[PDB]
Each structure stands twice: as C-alpha cells, then as structure tokens.
Design a protein around this ligand. Structure first.
Ligand SMILES: [Ca+2]
Ligand SMILES: [Ca+2]
Ligand SMILES: [Ca+2]
Ligand SMILES: [Ca+2]
Ligand SMILES: [Ca+2]
Ligand SMILES: [Ca+2]
Lengths: 216, 214
C-alpha cells in the first residue's frame, strides 16, 4: 500500500535544528544496484538555491534553514535516482513542500481614526460606516489571519450605553437603538478593536468618530 | 520512486472545512481486484473514536474535526485493504499523523510576586534568584512555547538605574553593578516580563522583590 501523492507540510519559523530531515526517498531498484539521489527545482538548484538538499546515499530530504510562508508558501521540486553505472533508472519524482502558517503577524487597522455620519432619525439596523484591519497571515486554512472586530467603549454614554454595534467579521458599524439627537449629543467616539485568531490572538486598537446630522 | 515512510503533519485548530481530505491510499492490487479501504487505531476505532475516517472506495483519509496538539500530539493508525471477501490482500500500512503546534497559549508567570535576597558585598555577575513563566505550546520544534525574559523597570534608581539584569532564556536574575548598601537601599522592586515566540509574541508581567542583606 502507498499514498498516491504525499506532500510535506512544514511549519514556517521552525527551530530545527538545521539541517532538518523531512522524508526519505527510496528507489525500488535498491537491490539490483547502488543508487545515488539528488534534487532540482526552485528551492534546490534554481533560486532560491540550497534551501533544500538531499543526502546522496541515504535519500533523506533535508531542509537547510527556517522557512517564511509570507515569502514563499509552496515549493515544487524533483527527486532523481541514478545507478552507480550512471544511468537514470526511473522517472524523476514530484516533491511538493507546503509551508503552513504561523501567527507571526499582528493585525493592523488601515487608519488610526475612521469617520462617519448618520441622520438623527434613523431606524435601528442602519449602516453607519465600515472599518478595516488587515493581517498578513493565512486566513483560509488557519485563524491566524482571521480578524474579529469589537467595540470596546462609547463616549459619551447617553442616552444609552450601547448605541452602536459592530459586525464581528465585516467591520460594518450599525445603529442599534433610537434616540439619536444632534442637539443633545452631536458626536460619538467609539474605541474599536481588531483581534486575530478570530478573537483569541493579539489585539490592536483604533477609533471611530460618528457625527450625528440634523433631519431639519 | 517513493517515500520510505511519509507521516502527515496537520496544524492544530484548522479551518477545514470538515471532513477534510489528507492523503489518499492505494493498493497495487487495484488492477486485478476490487478493493475496500478502512482504518483502525486510537483516533479511528479506539478512543478517541471517529476523529479520522476513510472513504471505503476512493481510499481518501479524512480528518473529521479540528485537532488540539495540547490534547493529543501524535496519532498512530493502520490502513487496511480488503477484497470483497473482507480478507486482507496485503500488510496493513502504518499511518503517522503529527499534530503541529499553533501559538494558542499565552505565557504565565508561576507567581505574581517572586522574592529573593543578596548580600550587599557581592561581585557583579552574582546570581540572586530565578523567576519562571510557563507556556503550554511547543518549545521544541516551534518558538510558540519559548519564553523570553526581560526587566521592564527598577525602583528605586539608586545608586544607579541598571543594578540587575535577567538572563533572557533562563529567568535567572543577576547583579551587574557594585554599590549595593542595605543602609542606603534595603529593597528593590523589579517589574519583569515574559514574552513567548522568543520575544515576538504575547507578553505577561510580574514582580521581583530583592532584599539586600547586611
Ligand atoms: Ca513569516
Ligand atoms: Ca504567518
Ligand atoms: Ca495574525
Ligand atoms: Ca490547542
Ligand atoms: Ca499550541
Ligand atoms: Ca505560546
């Protein structure tokens, strides 16, 4: 029995030590001859050179230094086997290295202060504005690049304390209660937060300033 | 050409979606007979049951839910190939799942306040005390569980500002300058910090109180 395709998943920023053994190659021609192994491709003999290597006799695939997914996320290499007589015995083998993500980037708001406005009359559920934070980490297979938005505080606290809400994943801010009155309170300052790992990681902070406009 | 053996490395807390394909099994007897695949072992048919599964006809190995390395770090399963009989055609295959670490734990000092003492006479380079923070994440293959120690502040700043240092990875605090005098300053309060990812991750804070003896 065997795998049809077996890619090797390697976390970025590994401790090693280096050089670090990955998986071991084997030509089933072993008994008939002595085999010598080598590799080619971007990562081996094309740039970036010498990130990966092979032990010529044992067939161990080696990683020579820690990887950075944000720099290169995938490698496609080829492994070769030649007899002691010098003849390429079999087709070269496809080697796929998948670099898996670590949470090595903090989220960042696109601005320190976002600004929006809304009419004093509006219905609860009305969009005011949208805020945005970015995270360079993977948000598809991991949560490391997935951001959770929240409102930390509101100022002032009148009439109600919880006048707005923020959509947890889109960053759209909405009005959730009535009684907006420009004459009483013309401006609210919301301290907003974006936290990666969908709310369990690092947090960064910005501000949203909401102007209340007079409906005649 | 092939791998002698090929373990599968799966990051914990994956998004999937689930069930999630890992790698695909294949018997060489595919060509001469119809094959049905299955798996056994802790993770499959022993507890924890049904974390992994196999598509009986295609041979795809499936992960049914996200993994937690801190709960189980490694699985050893066996893959089987049987004829319509139910009879093994070849030896079962060893399946190794390695669960790779995510930084899902913050570091924590063992105490909020550590206490130590040192004689007023001592030479620079003298050990005072050792402080400790733990991190449940992997500190062997990743930095996620590796802690970096630092001194944030000293009080008072007398005779001067930098009287102690902390060893970045052991948490041992040492005297780095002379002029300790109990009669002048009997006690120092150091704000200390432990940061995971060897200094690039989350930080937590505690206090070290050092008594000067006569
Ligand atoms: Ca990186
Ligand atoms: Ca990353
Ligand atoms: Ca991140
Ligand atoms: Ca975990
Ligand atoms: Ca972990
Ligand atoms: Ca950690």
């Amino acid at each position: 029995m065997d795998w049809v395709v077996a890619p090797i998943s390697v976390p970025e920023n590994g401790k090693g030590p280096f050089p670090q053994r990955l998986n071991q190659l084997k030509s089933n021609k072993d008994r008939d001859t002595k085999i010598f192994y080598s590799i080619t491709g971007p990562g081996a003999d094309s740039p970036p050179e010498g990130v990966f290597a092979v032990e010529k006799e044992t067939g161990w695939l080696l990683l020579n230094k820690p990887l950075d997914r944000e720099e290169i996320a995938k490698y496609e290499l080829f492994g070769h086997a030649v007899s002691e007589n010098g003849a390429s015995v079999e087709d070269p083998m496809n080697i796929s290295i998948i670099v898996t993500d670590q949470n090595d980037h903090k989220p960042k708001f696109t601005q320190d202060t976002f600004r929006g406005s809304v009419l004093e009359g509006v219905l609860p559920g009305t969009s005011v504005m949208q805020v945005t934070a970015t995270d360079e980490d993977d948000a598809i297979y991991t949560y490391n690049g997935v951001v959770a938005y929240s409102i930390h505080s509101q100022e002032p606290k009148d009439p109600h304390d919880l006048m707005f809400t923020i959509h947890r994943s889109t960053g759209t801010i909405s009005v959730i209660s009535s009684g907006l009155d420009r004459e009483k309170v013309p401006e609210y300052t919301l301290t907003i937060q974006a936290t990666d790992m969908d709310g369990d990681g690092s947090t960064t902070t910005a501000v949203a300033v909401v102007e209340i406009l007079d409906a005649n």
